[PDB]
């Protein structure tokens, strides 16, 4: 399978709005978990949301959410009530749940608030 697509490459959105990304796959794997990543100024990576959702998993904020589109290949990484703090670079990635796990991550898309 091919790496996913994180669009749009640049999303400029006014403060306190609904900013929504799109993580699209050409072909899906049988078992996989999709992750939403954000790069911190410390050159770190933070996992904000994950599909499928695990309500018991700590650290998840109610603002950032991932939504599976009806076609099952495309996803919606939306944030509600966007803050100027949210300005940064984002990316999506999938990890297969097969024995030999393969990492397939998108390119980076910047968010501006």
């Amino acid at each position, epitope marked *: 399978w091919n790496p996913p697509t994180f669009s749009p490459a640049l999303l400029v959105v006014t403060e306190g709005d609904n900013a929504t990304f799109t993580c699209s796959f050409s072909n899906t794997s049988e078992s996989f*978990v999709l992750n939403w990543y954000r790069m911190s100024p410390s050159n770190q*990576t933070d*996992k904000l949301a994950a599909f499928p959702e*695990d309500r*018991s*998993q700590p650290g998840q904020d109610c603002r950032f959410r991932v939504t599976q589109l009806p076609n099952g290949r495309d996803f919606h990484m939306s944030v509600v009530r966007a803050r100027r703090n949210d300005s940064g670079t984002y990316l999506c990635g999938a990890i297969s749940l097969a024995p030999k796990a393969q*990492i397939k991550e998108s390119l980076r898309a910047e968010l501006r608030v």
Partner: antibody, heavy 117, light 114 residues
Framework: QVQLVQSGAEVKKPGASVKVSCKASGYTFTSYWINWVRQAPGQGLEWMGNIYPGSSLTNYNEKFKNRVTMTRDTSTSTVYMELSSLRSEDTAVYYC??????????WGQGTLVTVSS | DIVMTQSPDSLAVSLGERATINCKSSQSLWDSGNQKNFLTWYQQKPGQPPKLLIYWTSYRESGVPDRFSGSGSGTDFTLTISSLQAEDVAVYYCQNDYFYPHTFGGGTKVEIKR
């Protein structure tokens, strides 16, 4: 919630063998790697092995050449760890953990195995 | 076999300053198939199961605070706490997550200097 409950503490004699259970719940049990890590009193952690419940693939540590044995039971969603030819040095708390790379890490509460005459 | 050496063995930092722990591996932990450095950092308080802090050298697990930050590439790696709080006193282990066996480092005790 995701939970890993391990079997209770056990005391064994030198030369015996212990079998520690680890019951997974709250996720697709057969799809995630389950690790075994032990910690002797006053010493760091030591990786012991891997098991993939989907096909019972195992990755043992070379330190326990033929002493360690990992198995699974899909009907009860439990993984078992067996260590034979026990020594006093094998006295430790043994942990099971769901550690599939890139996914969230969960841990059992631990199991104390005392090896002493 | 991968050998993980952690230096210093023990570290004393005042409350609120920066702590740095080093971890050197005998072989490279780089994976060309995933473009990642497979190194994990763990935190363990006495009487508690270990807690995963950083995976893939510089990826933060959900719930890990801001102060924890991983870095390095190849055979040299580093875990840094920018603002050492009281709740950070624990032993920190680096672990080879790349090739089998997934050997641990000796650990580094982090205590509050007073």
């Amino acid at each position: 919630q995701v939970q890993l409950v391990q079997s209770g503490a056990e005391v064994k004699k030198p030369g015996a063998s212990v079998k520690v259970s680890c019951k997974a719940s709250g996720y697709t049990f057969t799809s995630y790697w389950i690790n075994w890590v032990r910690q002797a009193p006053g010493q760091g952690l030591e990786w012991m092995g891997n098991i993939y419940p989907g096909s019972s693939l195992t990755n043992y540590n070379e330190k326990f050449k033929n002493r360690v044995t990992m198995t699974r039971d899909t009907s009860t969603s439990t993984v078992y760890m067996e260590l034979s030819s026990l020594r006093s040095e094998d006295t430790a708390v043994y942990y099971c953990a769901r550690l599939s790379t890139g996914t969230f890490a969960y841990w059992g509460q631990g199991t104390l195995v005392t090896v002493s005459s | 076999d991968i050998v993980m050496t952690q230096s210093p063995d023990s570290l004393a930092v005042s409350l609120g300053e920066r702590a740095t722990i080093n971890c050197k591996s005998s072989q490279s932990l780089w994976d060309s198939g995933n473009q990642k450095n497979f190194l994990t950092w763990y935190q363990q308080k006495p009487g508690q199961p270990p807690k995963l802090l950083i995976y893939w050298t510089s990826y933060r697990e959900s719930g890990v605070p801001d102060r924890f930050s991983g870095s390095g590439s190849g055979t040299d790696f580093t875990l840094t706490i920018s603002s050492l709080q009281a709740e950070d006193v624990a032993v920190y282990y680096c672990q080879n997550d790349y090739f089998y066996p997934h050997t641990f480092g000796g650990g580094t005790k982090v205590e509050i200097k007073r």
